[PDB]
Amino acid sequence: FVEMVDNLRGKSGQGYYVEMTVGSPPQTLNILVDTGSSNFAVGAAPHPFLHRYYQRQLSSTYRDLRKGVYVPYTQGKWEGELGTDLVSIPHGPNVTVRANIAAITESDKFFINGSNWEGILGLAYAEIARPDDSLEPFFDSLVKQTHVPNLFSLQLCGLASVGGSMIIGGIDHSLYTGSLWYTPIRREWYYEVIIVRVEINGQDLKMDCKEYNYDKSIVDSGTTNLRLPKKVFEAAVKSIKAASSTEKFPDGFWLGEQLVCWQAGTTPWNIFPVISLYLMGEVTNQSFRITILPQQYLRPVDCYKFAISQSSTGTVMGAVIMEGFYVVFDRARKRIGFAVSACHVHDEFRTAAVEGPFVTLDMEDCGYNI
Numbered sequence: 001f002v003e004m005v006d007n008l009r010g011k012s013g014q015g016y017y018v019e020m021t022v023g024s025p026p027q028t029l030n031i032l033v034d035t036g037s038s039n040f041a042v043g044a045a046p047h048p049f050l051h052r053y054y055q056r057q058l059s060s061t062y063r064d065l066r067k068g069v070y071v072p073y074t075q076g077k078w079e080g081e082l083g084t085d086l087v088s089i090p091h092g093p094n095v096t097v098r099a100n101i102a103a104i105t106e107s108d109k110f111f112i113n114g115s116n117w118e119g120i121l122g123l124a125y126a127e128i129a130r131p132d133d134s135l136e137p138f139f140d141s142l143v144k145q146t147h148v149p150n151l152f153s154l155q156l157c158g159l160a161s162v163g164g165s166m167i168i169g170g171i172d173h174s175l176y177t178g179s180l181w182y183t184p185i186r187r188e189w190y191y192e193v194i195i196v197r198v199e200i201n202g203q204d205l206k207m208d209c210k211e212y213n214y215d216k217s218i219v220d221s222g223t224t225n226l227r228l229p230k231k232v233f234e235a236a237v238k239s240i241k242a243a244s245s246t247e248k249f250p251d252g253f254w255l256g257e258q259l260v261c262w263q264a265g266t267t268p269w270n271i272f273p274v275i276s277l278y279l280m281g282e283v284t285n286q287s288f289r290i291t292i293l294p295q296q297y298l299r300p301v302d303c304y305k306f307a308i309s310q311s312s313t314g315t316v317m318g319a320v321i322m323e324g325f326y327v328v329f330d331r332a333r334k335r336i337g338f339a340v341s342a343c344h345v346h347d348e349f350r351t352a353a354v355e356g357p358f359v360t361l362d363m364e365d366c367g368y369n370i
């Protein structure tokens, strides 16, 4: 899938985007790739932050659905007008599909000042689409209307410019080393998974594993940080604090309230512990683990921010997790694959890892239910 490699760009902390076209003749837009939502929505008015926007008046293939959509989320809001049009991905499969497009006509804290994207591609499932699950997500339309296989994979490589690959309809083996290990998609809404054990430098946090997935754990390309439920974050910080105690930092730093700095080239990587998440495996009583480095959870702003934070919406495996791995969203088999990314950032002492099998009992009890 050579044509799709390196089809993602971005700025640190502002997400990864892919070039798309909408309408006839095609209008080119850069679109944020978001596995944590399910709408395709694009700027359609001259907001001052935008390089460009969708001009429905210029598209002969535009169809109005004559319905509005209103989308508040935890950190912002957009609203718009529903329609369909022809959509393609220039550095994707050689196909063109008729997709739902929300033309964004009002927004708050959605667009980012200085960013180079103009819309959002929600790759999650219809259950969390707005206004409801009748609005078919883009990927659902793509698979229904073409022979593109029902899967995609992401290699996120990490203002400094970031890069990556979105392989639509397949897997590119040059993007990872070792084997893929798969964890089940628990339910098709978000890309929900189940974490069955957590270790900091190989030391089990020893919490009831339900806490790790309260109220859910998801794989989310549209979140920068690793977000952990409050109780788990407390416990994880406590352990990370202890493991790194040879150098002392202010309390606010652990809350993301301030940075920490060292002289260029002397960041003490080795004093910071690795973080391991064991995920439910494909087989009964079988798990595997993924392990990330401080290179993943200490974000450049040599100064750095702590990129793990507390959550009230469950665990979010954001860019901090994903930049460690090649991640396969195997929708066809209701599973997510992880393999060590060929592009992840590390040092000569430690590298991100995907390892298994491990023996883990009562993994079904780790899932949260109402």
Ligand SMILES: NC1=N[C@@]2(CO1)c1cc(-c3cccnc3F)ccc1Oc1c(F)cc(C3=CCOCC3)cc12
Pocket: 013, 014, 015, 016, 032, 034, 035, 036, 037, 038, 071, 072, 073, 076, 077, 078, 110, 120, 128, 130, 220, 221, 222, 223, 224
């Ligand atoms: N993953 C996720 N995507 C969000 C929030 O988190 C998001 C992230 C970004 C962003 C910002 C910075 C860096 N990287 C990003 F992806 C930008 C804009 C943005 O917009 C929306 C949005 F409009 C709706 C929703 C939802 C709609 C319906 O229910 C599910 C949530 C989520 C998001």
